[PDB]
């Protein structure tokens, strides 16, 4: 795990890093997503220890991992993603690394749940929660094909999706 990644990165150079990235991408493609979490974790560990858009992505991932329900880190990551120029496979790789991470997926789900709970408490249902959900969906759907931009927001469907949460909250309030 960590020891193996450190041993692999010990021979750290430009060519070594390029080869490691290519191998990680190939492994992620073969596993259909399984290797993405391992590649992201290895990249984050390398950046954290003797690290030297990759640095920004690693910092955002570290902030998300540290704060399961953190909001400032999420806002910073959203700003960084928005301020990313369209490019050939760069944004695709970033989104794939973000999405294909079971820890990352769990953190995104927890953040979405916290945002939904806060929205229910504030009674302001539709809004950074929508942007976060769109980013999560784009990250999840990036693995379908290469050279992908994003996925539809589905604002109309968002209200229908949130309707079950409102019904559950109303049921809980009536019971209490």
């Amino acid at each position: 795990e960590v020891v193996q990644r450190l041993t692999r990165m010990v021979g750290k150079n430009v060519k070594l890093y390029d080869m490691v990235l290519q191998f990680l991408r190939t492994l992620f493609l073969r596993t259909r997503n399984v290797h993405y979490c391992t590649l992201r974790a290895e990249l984050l560990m390398s950046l954290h220890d003797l690290d030297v858009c990759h640095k920004f992505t690693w910092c955002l991932d570290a902030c998300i991992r540290e704060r399961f329900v953190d909001s400032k880190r999420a806002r910073e990551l959203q700003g960084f993603l928005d301020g990313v120029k369209k490019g050939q496979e760069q944004v695709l790789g970033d989104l794939s690394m973000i999405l294909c991470d079971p820890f990352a997926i769990n953190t995104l789900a927890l953040s979405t749940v916290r945002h939904l709970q806060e929205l229910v408490g504030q009674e302001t249902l539709p809004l950074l929660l929508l942007l976060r959900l769109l980013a999560l969906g784009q990250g999840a759907w990036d693995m379908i094909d290469s050279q992908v931009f994003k996925e539809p927001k589905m604002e109309v469907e968002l209200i229908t999706r949130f309707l079950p949460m409102l019904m559950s909250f109303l049921v809980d309030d009536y019971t209490f």
Binding site: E123, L125, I159, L163, L166, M167, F169, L170, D173, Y174, F176
Partner: peptide, 22 residues
Amino acid sequence: VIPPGLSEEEEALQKKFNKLKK
């Protein structure tokens, strides 16, 4: 304050269903 809490809960429940169309 139980009556006030119940009234607030009822109002919130009524308002929650108003956003279904929107």
